[PDB]
Symmetry: D2
Subunit: 301 residues, 4 copies
């Protein structure tokens, strides 16, 4: 036998950081969950009980907290790049660091119409995430995402004109509920190293904000022909607004809300135009995915 692939490290490292402005009194908090997995010349730890090649996962944990103490933790694209770069620079035999960060929301409270200097609310379980792959000799590859953004529209969604054969029971509809949990990912151009990442720092928060804005406005305003058609519109707009991202990926469940025929009970009308009460379905669910990039076709367009 031989080792074909290996990576190891510390997962589920919860990290909080506070910034205190002593002049103004305003405090700002950040909370994340971090995973760092390393690759390199480590195969003998598996094959020969050679622990000399292992940077202990406990040490990786320590390093996450030390790096958070010594650097900004925002934007997460930067923090992840600093953290991954540390491992491949510090350890000659480590050649890749894979850093995943989930950022948790702590939104400043407004009390009596004024932002409070040191109190926060988890205003959504929506996350902002990064996946930062730092590969020695091959730069830094970053995927940024938002996830757990749960939305519903009560009309202006349709689904008709789909294939119908002997496996089909679904009725066409010109007016349905559409609800999803949005997972949207934008993948950046490869960066050559940490200096290039730093050179683009403002673009990270700006592009996350664009992605979120476009997602919400397109969902709300598109009289949707399908999940497929709507998500594509989102992706094409995000690509148009940031030239440093190469692709946009969406993964969207179709969280079904079924009509309830009540006509068996006193002739109650609760379908079609009279549909008011629905049964949300926990499972199963449609699942619709696509990755959108920029065109390179010049004929047969």
């Amino acid at each position: 036998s031989a080792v074909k692939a290996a990576r190891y490290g510390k997962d589920n490292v919860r990290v909080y950081k506070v910034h205190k402005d002593e002049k103004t009194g305003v405090q700002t908090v950040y909370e994340m969950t971090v995973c760092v997995l390393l690759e390199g010349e480590i195969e003998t730890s598996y094959t020969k009980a050679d622990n000399s090649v292992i940077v202990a996962t406990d040490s990786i944990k320590n390093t996450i907290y030390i790096t958070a103490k010594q650097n900004p933790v925002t934007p997460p694209e930067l923090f992840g790049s600093i953290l991954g770069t540390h491992f491949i620079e510090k350890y000659n035999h480590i050649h890749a660091a894979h850093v995943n960060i989930v950022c948790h929301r702590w939104t400043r409270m407004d009390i009596d119409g004024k932002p409070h200097p040191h109190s926060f609310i988890r205003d959504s379980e929506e996350k902002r995430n990064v996946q930062v792959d730092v590969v020695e000799g091959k730069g830094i590859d970053i995927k940024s995402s938002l996830s757990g953004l749960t939305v519903l529209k009560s009309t202006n969604s349709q689904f008709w004109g789909f294939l119908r054969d002997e496996y089909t029971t679904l009725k066409e509809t010109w007016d349905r509920i559409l609800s999803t949990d949005v997972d949207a990912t934008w993948q950046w151009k490869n960066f050559s190293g940490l200096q290039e990442v730093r050179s683009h720092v403002p673009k990270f928060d700006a592009t996350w904000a664009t992605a979120r804005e476009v997602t919400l406005k397109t969902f709300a305003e598109d009289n949707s022909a399908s999940v497929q058609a709507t998500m594509y519109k989102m992706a094409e707009q995000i690509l148009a607004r940031q030239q440093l991202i190469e692709t946009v990926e969406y993964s969207l469940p179709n969280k079904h809300y079924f009509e309830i025929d009540l006509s068996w009970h006193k002739g109650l009308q609760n379908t079609g135009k009279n549909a008011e009460v629905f049964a949300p379905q926990s499972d199963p669910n449609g699942l619709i995915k696509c990755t959108v990039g920029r065109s390179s076709l010049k004929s047969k367009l």
Copy 2:
């Protein structure tokens, strides 16, 4: 043997309702999870295989949807009262109905600064709940609550002066993080029936809003001596603002954020006044409870 207590029914009934204003185009959505459990002269279903006394749980489910079609689903205190009253009135041998409702958030989206007529966001997993116990001959007992309201303050929390003995290792502190998930319950005066509940309908939304407002403002503004002291202040204020509630209950976890001593690494200072990076602890957690009512002591106060 004999049956000492029994109740049965349908749990986890997911319900959506939409209201459409055809004049304005504005749509409003409601989503809940409902449980209804019945009591009455049902013991022979357990002891004698007598199913004649069972209103099938499937029928209870149907009844939840029919009742939602024929009545408002808001405020949940009213919906639960209508629903519970139905069972004890319709079925002579059913003498209590226990209705639990969890209301899920669907907050209207603002798009380009304007409220959208038919698009919504799950802006928090915070819930608004009711427990409505409709007992034949003994009226309607309602407990209203908010739950899953997750908050954090980064300073202006203290904990010192606690008992110290041979089991104690905890350091006193004059400046710590305080974070919790708020579960707050207000219990209403007994109502004689559905007419009395209806007579107080506006008070339900108003009292939920007061409870939420008081919770947030007191959390944010109290330079807290303990979880105990802060929660008591919340409860006393809510009681002062609604004379139809008899008690207020809080159940609050103390979700610990531990300092991380980094002085072993290059003399890094990350404790006390220099504490910036903390380790959120998933478990264990303090758990602090109290039920507050109005005083009746006239001496030794």
Copy 3:
């Protein structure tokens, strides 16, 4: 305002203990999650910022680990009684201790047909639990339970003869699937203190084993008329087999498996006698409860 009820303590305290027989080499492991909440003369911690009356939750945590080091952790009824007794004896002003223990399964592995001396498998997420309420001057009240015991039978369950009215759509059936997650609780006679608990120690494991055995055999063998009828049979048998328990409680979901009519597709027959493929329903679910005790009726039986 005044404090009407209060309790506080530490929740979610994970505890492992190992026993090592140095003569044989056999090791035995125990893992639990513990909650201890205290009551007593603590109201001034809420009303007056008086922390002197608070035994810190951190200290309660320490005490759980110290007590586990100094005593057996099995049976959990005993451990919980020792632990609760400690708080009301050690602290004059603490007058009740409420101890909840969830015991996690670590079943010894059999390797090549022989029990391994120090390797274990989580063979089920089924739990064994206790609730031990130690109340100064009023002894020790113990509720023991098993929970998360998930079972299914593919026939020999029926449900017919239930009430039928204008809310009813459910078809009678003489052959259905029955599946549940069993939560069964037995409540012991009040014990006067720790000596009386100790005097009955062997009965705890024996009664848990009886409850489990009776549950499984009755589920498997009863040609069930309803969940109600089957659960009652379980309870009556457990009461008959242990005179020191006063009541038995079951709480059982009816986890529905729906037939799927496929006759629209090539005349496929998949209902009634030809039902082979079913759709498990995640929600909603029936929920059926009862508490059974010993009879005291002497007439009209």
Copy 4:
């Protein structure tokens, strides 16, 4: 813009099937959760609101149940292959089907020492899974796995000789607890189509059983130098026992159990040789991965 990748279908489809032997009375149950995602000439559903190319997810759901009615659901490798093959054969424009199956345990109950003909227990949340990728013109690629197999050994695990630098605090140990949740995957040689899959049907259950047996015995018997070293031994043995699998992958968390120093309390000794009571850590956790294949090195071995 253009579509670079797309797939869509139905997720979270719960499926039960029963087999009834009418001669013997013995019934056997199967329960799974299924996901099927399709690829093909579908880009215009995203770019042009062309629903004609969409086989509705609802129809995919119907097809899962129909296929389960008309075919064996075991082994899952076969069922997934039949199901995926159906989509690429039935629909000219569909060119890949990605089928994921999670199989849930229903183990026959033994009652009074005899296997019961129609009653079952969920004896573990451990799963058996498959990922079957059916790609037109490129056969069938199958990955089989077991997951959620939670184990612990109380001794005969070590971790010493790891890299030590200025980021390291971890103590070397020659005797620790080792606990994990095993996720083990074996990837089969590419199969040319459904006939080749069928030709190897007995190997699927046999190889799952080997993987499980090897996992448990190696975990129990290896005096482990590290998670890395132990998992490699598992993988090499599985490869040696089935020539039709090309690689074996393990993904193992190191679920830490920390010693508790109690020497501050009455000199209690609970470390090293006297360690009996430990604190299981929910997070963070080590995470150790490797993919093992057969060697092809002929020099510098």
